[PDB]
Amino acid sequence: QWALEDFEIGRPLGKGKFGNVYLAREKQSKFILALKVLFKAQLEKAGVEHQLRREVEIQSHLRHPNILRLYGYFHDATRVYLILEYAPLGTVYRELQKLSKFDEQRTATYITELANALSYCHSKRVIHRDIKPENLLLGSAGELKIADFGWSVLCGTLDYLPPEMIEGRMHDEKVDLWSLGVLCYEFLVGKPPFEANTYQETYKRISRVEFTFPDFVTEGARDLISRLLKHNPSQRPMLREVLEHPWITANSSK
Ligand SMILES: CS(=O)(=O)N(CCN)c1ccc(Nc2ncc3cnn(C4CCCCCC4)c3n2)cn1
Numbered sequence: 001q002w003a004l005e006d007f008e009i010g011r012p013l014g015k016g017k018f019g020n021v022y023l024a025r026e027k028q029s030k031f032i033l034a035l036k037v038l039f040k041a042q043l044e045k046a047g048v049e050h051q052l053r054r055e056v057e058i059q060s061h062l063r064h065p066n067i068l069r070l071y072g073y074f075h076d077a078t079r080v081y082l083i084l085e086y087a088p089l090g091t092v093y094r095e096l097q098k099l100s101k102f103d104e105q106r107t108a109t110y111i112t113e114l115a116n117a118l119s120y121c122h123s124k125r126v127i128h129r130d131i132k133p134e135n136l137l138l139g140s141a142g143e144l145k146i147a148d149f150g151w152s153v154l155c156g157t158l159d160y161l162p163p164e165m166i167e168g169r170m171h172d173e174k175v176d177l178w179s180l181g182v183l184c185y186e187f188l189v190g191k192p193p194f195e196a197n198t199y200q201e202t203y204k205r206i207s208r209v210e211f212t213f214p215d216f217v218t219e220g221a222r223d224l225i226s227r228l229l230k231h232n233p234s235q236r237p238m239l240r241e242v243l244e245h246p247w248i249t250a251n252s253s254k
């Protein structure tokens, strides 16, 4: 349906390797979109096409206001182009750099928006597996929007992954609930509960669930995080249960 000459490319958004992402406009509708440009070249040379057609399968047929939209696509046999919803306030990664920490209010608010979106995801049997600030985007009203269902169902940051996954074991939708715990912490503290300087050391830190709270960490948070980051998936809060945590209802600007 679409082709390249359909768009005026604009400002580079991000890099990353996959390829690049550009802001751009549909010539004839004047619509504003994010265009991710992925090279077929390095696509096979690193064998991932199966996860791509599948990111699309999910992200095209999915619909929450807290999930980014794919509109579709096309190719030229050098690259594939994804036609993406554009999130004008950028990454939650960059807000985090910009303010180093977040406050309890913003945080819960993001934890909420993320639980609904995950909740809608898990209703439909889907596990994102890769929610991390760099994949968390922001709408004009400043709402959270999850992107990037690439690794959806050695090598790449361990920080957000739960024991069972990192050890290669049998997992469920409960994994995203560990991520959300790590997320929760990461917002309040400046950096992931399990950070490290190496991947083998982060392997350890995660396997043994070794995290601690800076003094300014309220007990409301200490509780949501302690409960979300239990090694055993059985005893991980349900998504509904999360929305309903005393600390969440008190702080979310829902
Ligand atoms: C300040 S910023 O980092 O947040 N930023 C400017 C970049 N130098 C920025 C980044 C992203 C956006 N919007 C936007 N809209 C839609 C999408 C869809 N995929 N992506 C990826 C996700 C972020 C990682 C970089 C690659 C781009 C999108 N990004 C705006 N401003």
Ligand SMILES: [Mg+2]
Pocket (backbone or CB within 6 Å): 051, 052, 055, 149, 150, 151
């Ligand atoms: Mg992908």
